[PDB]
Amino acid sequence: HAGIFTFECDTIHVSESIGVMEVKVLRTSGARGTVIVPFRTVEGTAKGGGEDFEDAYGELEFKNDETVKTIRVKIVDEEEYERQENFFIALGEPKWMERGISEVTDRKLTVEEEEAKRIAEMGKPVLGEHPKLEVIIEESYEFKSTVD
């Protein structure tokens, strides 16, 4: 089926002065056909709108080999700030556009295919385990790893 969409990490740090933050959006080997996937900026504690960041929402087209893509969110810079800002970017709904999934008005098939081919023709993608990345606007970053 059309692949699971998820981000690389659950937690990231930027600073305003980065200009624009990016998350890489991955797609599993379910990458059969083209799927379009929206995203949008979601503050946790922030002012939002155009005020600690610009609300950055759009759609990303993911084709077969294209199973790596990115989301850009411009950060606004005001400096000398006494407060940590926090936001994340969540995905909307992945939708298959290479196919045209529609109602089964007629698909005369064999018995096995009556469900099996029908389900395969719906091909519906879904979100994954980490379809969001939490960003903290703060000095520098912290990172760790374990296991080979």
Residue spans per domain, the chain: 1-148
Return d(Cα 27, Cα 66) in angstroms, integer. 8
* DSSP β-bridge partners for residue 111: none
Experimental technique of record: NMR
List the CATH code of the domain at 1-148: 2.60.40.2030
The residue among 20, 65, 44, 34 whose CA lies nearest residue 132 is 44
CA atoms within a 13 Å half-sphere pointing along the CA-CB vector of 144? 2
Is residue 56 classed exposed, middle or buried when 0-12, 13-18 and 19+ CB atoms within 10 A define those classes? middle
Residues written for the chain? 148
**DSSP label of 121:** H
Is 139 annotated as a binding-site member?
A: yes
Cα distances (Å, whole numbers) of residue 127 to 8, 48, 57, 93: 13, 25, 17, 7
- Return the beta strands (E) in the chain as ranges: 5-7, 11-14, 20-27, 35-45, 58-62, 68-74, 85-91, 95-96, 132-137
* DSSP β-bridge partners for residue 90: 40, 132
Cα distances (Å, whole numbers) of residue 133 to 69, 101, 136, 139: 14, 30, 10, 18
Return d(Cα 111, Cα 48) in angstroms, integer. 53
H helices of 1-148, where?
Answer: 111-122
* DSSP β-bridge partners for residue 62: 35
